[PDB]
Amino acid sequence: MFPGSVIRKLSHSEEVFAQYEVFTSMTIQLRGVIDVDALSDAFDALLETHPVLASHLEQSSDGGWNLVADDLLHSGICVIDAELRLDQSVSLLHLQLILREGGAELTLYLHHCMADGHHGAVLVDELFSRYTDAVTTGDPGPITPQPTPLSMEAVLAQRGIRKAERFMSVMYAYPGLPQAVPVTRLWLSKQQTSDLMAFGREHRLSLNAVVAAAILLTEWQLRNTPHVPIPYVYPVDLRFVLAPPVAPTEATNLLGAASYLAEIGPNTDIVDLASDIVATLRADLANGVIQQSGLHFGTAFEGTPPGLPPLVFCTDATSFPTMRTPPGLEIEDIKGQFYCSISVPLDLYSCAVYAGQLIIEHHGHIAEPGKSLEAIRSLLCTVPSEYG
């Protein structure tokens, strides 16, 4: 509504991101001439299509958080040639362009209470779609403003759905200024990827499916604790699962959480593990466990709960291709990073295939960041060659 007025209170599912001042960034390394004027038009046009982004959070007397509306007259790009303070109470979106040699660095900051990976990616893609239309044409494209995207509990309420479920047995058995989260990243040669892929569909599996196995195996090899299970959790976009489908910007965060207690022994086989995981998902979907369980992937930012072995979180956020860029500009790299407030127990893995190259990542304040990532690294290059 009018700036200063309350848009809506955040849903319990969204509060995680407010409680840990979680912000998500997306940086595109560029090469070429950035027509800043046109870029600013695209950013302004985008904001008019998603007027919610023009707000901030205010913790209500009732312990909850209010999404309060702001004005769009203040939100503009920020060109440069840390130097920045992300603050929930102030803004939830920041477009930072840093000019460089051949190309500059485009970086979008988005508070996670307004979008999960999918919703955000769609925005990032919209931005570049408008820039291309802004440079190609004098117009960044038509603007049709959308209403306040729904919270997950809102989406379920519209449907029947009124209102962990596997880690109960292993139970007790066996936000000031935000700071960047350390992020380690390892790549794979165009070839090594193709090798892992070929090995993939040569077992009725997928990169993501295998990758998780590799991650889960390694976790055991370094846990220095045998026979102790490894609780696994990953995101599931309920947008293609639920009743009338939900569109990416239609909801804030609609990523369900799929649990899976991996029990790796010294003989456990990659495909064996990979396939069991994939199958369990299907069983849960078929039983409506994922749809009806209030579990969301935001829980990832809450680390491991009491009385439970270290949870392994991994997001299959492989994406960002087919992204429009006018003639003369080209994307050289796309890195994602979080900026939750210090002390966030964020232990998370992630992967994606960029330019036909698999990219492994480990996020969070952890000792020997590239330790497991490397163990997992060589493991994804071994399995495809020597399996028989």
From Swiss-Prot:
<comment type="function">
    <text>Catalyzes diesterification of phthiocerol, phthiodiolone, and phenolphthiocerol with mycocerosic acids, the final step in the phthiocerol, phthiodiolone and phenolphthiocerol dimycocerosate esters (PDIM) synthesis. Can directly transfer the mycocerosate bound to the mycocerosic acid synthase (mas) onto the substrate alcohols.</text>
</comment>
<protein>
    <recommendedName>
        <fullName>Phthiocerol/phthiodiolone dimycocerosyl transferase</fullName>
        <ecNumber>2.3.1.282</ecNumber>
    </recommendedName>
</protein>
<keyword id="KW-0443">Lipid metabolism</keyword>
<dbReference type="InterPro" id="IPR031641">
    <property type="entry name" value="PapA_C"/>
</dbReference>
<dbReference type="GO" id="GO:0006629">
    <property type="term" value="P:lipid metabolic process"/>
</dbReference>
<dbReference type="InterPro" id="IPR023213">
    <property type="entry name" value="CAT-like_dom_sf"/>
</dbReference>
<keyword id="KW-0444">Lipid biosynthesis</keyword>
<keyword id="KW-0808">Transferase</keyword>
<feature type="active site" description="Proton acceptor">
    <location>
        <position position="112"/>
    </location>
</feature>
<comment type="similarity">
    <text>Belongs to the acyltransferase PapA5 family.</text>
</comment>
<feature type="site" description="Important for mas ACP domain recognition">
    <location>
        <position position="282"/>
    </location>
</feature>
<dbReference type="Pfam" id="PF16911">
    <property type="entry name" value="PapA_C"/>
</dbReference>
<dbReference type="GO" id="GO:0016746">
    <property type="term" value="F:acyltransferase activity"/>
</dbReference>
<feature type="site" description="Structural role in the organization of the active site">
    <location>
        <position position="116"/>
    </location>
</feature>
<keyword id="KW-0012">Acyltransferase</keyword>
<comment type="subunit">
    <text>Monomer. Interacts directly with the acyl carrier protein (ACP) domain of the mycocerosic acid synthase (mas) protein.</text>
</comment>
